[PDB]
Design an enzyme around this catalytic site. Sequence first.
Site, short mmCIF file in Angstrom:
data_model
loop_
_atom_site.label_atom_id
_atom_site.label_comp_id
_atom_site.label_asym_id
_atom_site.label_seq_id
_atom_site.Cartn_x
_atom_site.Cartn_y
_atom_site.Cartn_z
N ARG A 1 0.81 -1.20 0.00
CA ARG A 1 0.00 0.00 0.00
C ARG A 1 0.85 1.26 0.00
O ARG A 1 0.42 2.32 -0.49
CB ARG A 1 -0.98 0.02 1.17
N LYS B 1 -13.97 -8.69 8.90
CA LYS B 1 -14.77 -7.47 9.06
C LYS B 1 -16.21 -7.80 8.78
O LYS B 1 -16.82 -7.36 7.79
CB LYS B 1 -14.24 -6.37 8.14
N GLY C 1 -5.84 -5.12 2.12
CA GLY C 1 -4.56 -5.03 2.78
C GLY C 1 -4.06 -6.37 3.23
O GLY C 1 -2.90 -6.67 3.05
N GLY D 1 -12.51 -3.99 0.82
CA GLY D 1 -13.85 -3.37 0.99
C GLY D 1 -14.18 -2.30 -0.05
O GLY D 1 -15.30 -2.25 -0.56
N1 LIG Z 1 -12.18 -17.59 10.70
C1 LIG Z 1 -11.56 -16.42 10.98
N2 LIG Z 1 -11.57 -15.83 12.20
C2 LIG Z 1 -10.94 -14.66 12.47
N3 LIG Z 1 -10.24 -13.95 11.54
C3 LIG Z 1 -10.17 -14.46 10.28
C4 LIG Z 1 -10.82 -15.71 9.92
N4 LIG Z 1 -10.59 -15.90 8.60
C5 LIG Z 1 -9.82 -14.87 8.17
N5 LIG Z 1 -9.56 -14.01 9.19
C6 LIG Z 1 -8.78 -12.77 9.15
O1 LIG Z 1 -9.30 -11.90 8.19
C7 LIG Z 1 -8.35 -10.83 8.14
C8 LIG Z 1 -8.55 -10.00 6.91
O2 LIG Z 1 -9.91 -9.57 6.76
P1 LIG Z 1 -10.16 -8.13 6.11
O3 LIG Z 1 -9.36 -7.11 6.87
O4 LIG Z 1 -11.65 -8.03 6.10
O5 LIG Z 1 -9.61 -8.34 4.62
P2 LIG Z 1 -8.74 -7.27 3.75
O6 LIG Z 1 -7.58 -6.84 4.61
O7 LIG Z 1 -8.28 -8.03 2.54
O8 LIG Z 1 -9.70 -6.13 3.41
C9 LIG Z 1 -6.98 -11.50 8.19
O9 LIG Z 1 -6.13 -10.78 9.09
C10 LIG Z 1 -7.33 -12.91 8.68
O10 LIG Z 1 -6.50 -13.39 9.78
F1 ALF Z 2 -9.06 -4.69 5.53
AL1 ALF Z 2 -9.67 -4.21 3.89
F2 ALF Z 2 -10.28 -3.77 2.27
F3 ALF Z 2 -8.03 -3.98 3.26
F4 ALF Z 2 -11.34 -4.29 4.48
CL LIG Z 3 -16.46 -4.84 10.55
MG LIG Z 4 -7.76 -5.92 6.40
#
Ligand SMILES: Nc1ncnc2c1ncn2[C@@H]1O[C@H](COP(=O)(O)OP(=O)(O)O)[C@@H](O)[C@H]1O
Ligand code: ALF
Ligand SMILES: [Cl-]
Ligand SMILES: [Mg+2]
Length: 405
Positions: free
Chosen positions: A37, A204, A362, A385
């Site tokens: 990023r 999330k 991220g 997101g």
């Molecule tokens: N079953 C689960 N319980 C808790 N955390 C989880 C589970 N599956 C995945 N994760 C967590 O989801 C996190 C990322 O989710 P999110 O922040 O929503 O995605 P992104 O960063 O791609 O937007 C990772 O840090 C991962 O450890």
């Molecule tokens: F944690 Al993200 F898109 F990077 F919800």
């Molecule tokens: Cl959330």
């Molecule tokens: Mg994330």
Amino acid sequence: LSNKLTLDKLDVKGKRVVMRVDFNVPMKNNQITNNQRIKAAVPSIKFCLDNGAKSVVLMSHLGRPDGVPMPDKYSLEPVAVELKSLLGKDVLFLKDCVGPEVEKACANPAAGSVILLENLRFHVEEEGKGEPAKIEAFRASLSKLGDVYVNDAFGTAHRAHSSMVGVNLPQKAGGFLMKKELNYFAKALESPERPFLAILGGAKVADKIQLINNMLDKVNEMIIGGGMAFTFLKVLNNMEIGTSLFDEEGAKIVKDLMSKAEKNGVKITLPVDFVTADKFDENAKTGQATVASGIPAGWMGLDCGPESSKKYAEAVTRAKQIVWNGPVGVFEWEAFARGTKALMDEVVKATSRGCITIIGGGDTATCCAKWNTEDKVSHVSTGGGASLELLEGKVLPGVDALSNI
Ligand SMILES: Nc1ncnc2c1ncn2[C@@H]1O[C@H](COP(=O)(O)OP(=O)(O)O)[C@@H](O)[C@H]1O
Ligand code: ALF
Ligand SMILES: [Cl-]
Ligand SMILES: [Mg+2]
């Protein structure tokens, strides 16, 4: 961004530039685990400096400190250090983002100064919940830090937060990362290849469960995995889920979502088995569970198991286009990484036979860094997101707030 001012047309000569970036980088054991990023914003930053900007003041959030200062846990100081290496210019880190002292540091800087402010979410006014005249004052303070504004924070563009929509300067321009990402998605989402699969995992749950309704009008299949799955399984299967992630509000719409998926011919693939943990820790004791067995009280599902991976693989094999946000387990910890690795293997294989594969976020992009697949899928986005909200067909608030041409 045809209708919006962008950085290519912003006169920055002798101007202080205040720039929103998404520097919400993943951290493990206190260290940055992916500089994706940060690297992604360098083209906009270098362009400002190369074209005579007096200064570039960078601002971002880090994590969700919820409007309290948490410098021990969520400081951007380590960013400021990484950014130096990637830019080839030094960066001054400030321990706040507003106040008289920040305003003085940014008022009249030496030519070519790069300045990184502390985590915006240490102030409740950024989100601002975690206060109307204080929100105004916060936005007014940020606006003093530059003469012109650039938003390159694609990964935060879905958030109508003070730094993203509230800066009051005459020229508010989209940065090159904002442009690159929006262009990629505009093309990929115009006439997707079908079946179009969305893979929705991660942690999330409260936020992202609310995106499913509109996504069901756009995709032909959805994997609902990671932390998202347990709310669905509790409601639909009366499954015992232990201490796994659960969203009370989203539970109330699970049946309606499944009804809509049926109405729209969207195949939903949920997991059927799990790797469990006795606490949220890398060295937790681990176990196994199925939807039928349930998860024991006091245990949480932190990965899917092998039968789930098979079902996920089946959906990926049918896909001609994929958008993936959210790992399907806690891939940062090796005990809980197998499901996400297996899915990554499938997504790479899909790409090699012509599938258009888009991974964003991220944390999810860090799966690509970890397993060296950044060049083995079609596009790795700095938005997760934010990208799902594009998939829904919305205008992002951070884009909407830019100056019109
Ligand atoms: N079953 C689960 N319980 C808790 N955390 C989880 C589970 N599956 C995945 N994760 C967590 O989801 C996190 C990322 O989710 P999110 O922040 O929503 O995605 P992104 O960063 O791609 O937007 C990772 O840090 C991962 O450890
Ligand atoms: F944690 Al993200 F898109 F990077 F919800
Ligand atoms: Cl959330
Ligand atoms: Mg994330």
